[PDB]
C-alpha cells in the first residue's frame, strides 16, 4: 500500500481548485490492501472534513 500510494493521480474537478481522483484503480488497490473503502478514502483525501 505504501508503494501504491505513489500512484495516486488527482486533477482539478472543474478548474475550481478542487481535487478529484484522476485514476481510481491504484486507489482501489490501496483501499483493498488495508481493507478500506475506496470511495470513502477518495472523498477524504479530496475533501478533508475538519
Amino acid at each position: 500500500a505504501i508503494m501504491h500510494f505513489g500512484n495516486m493521480k488527482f486533477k482539478l474537478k472543474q478548474r475550481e481548485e478542487q481535487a478529484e481522483p484522476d485514476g481510481t484503480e491504484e486507489a482501489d488497490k490501496s483501499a483493498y490492501l488495508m481493507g478500506l473503502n475506496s470511495a470513502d478514502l477518495l472523498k477524504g483525501l479530496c475533501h478533508p472534513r475538519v
Binding site: 481510481t24 484503480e25 482501489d28 488497490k29 483501499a31 483493498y32 473503502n37 475506496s38 470511495a39
Partner: protein, 50 residues
C-alpha cells in the same frame, strides 16, 4: 428519458453483493468496474437500461 439513478461502483458492490455473492469473490482481487459489470450481468435484467 435520461438515467435518474447513479450509484458508485464500490457502493454498488458492497450494497448489492447479496444478489450474486458468487460474483465478486470475497477478497480475491482488486477491481471495481469489472466486478460491478459481472454483478449486473449476472442479474438477468434488461442490460440496455444501464
Amino acid at each position: 428519458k435520461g438515467f435518474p439513478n447513479r450509484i458508485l461502483y464500490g457502493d454498488f458492490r458492497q450494497r448489492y453483493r447479496i444478489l450474486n455473492p458468487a460474483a465478486i469473490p470475497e477478497g480475491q482481487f482488486i477491481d471495481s468496474r469489472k466486478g460491478a459489470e459481472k454483478l449486473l450481468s449476472s442479474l438477468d435484467i434488461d442490460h440496455n437500461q444501464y
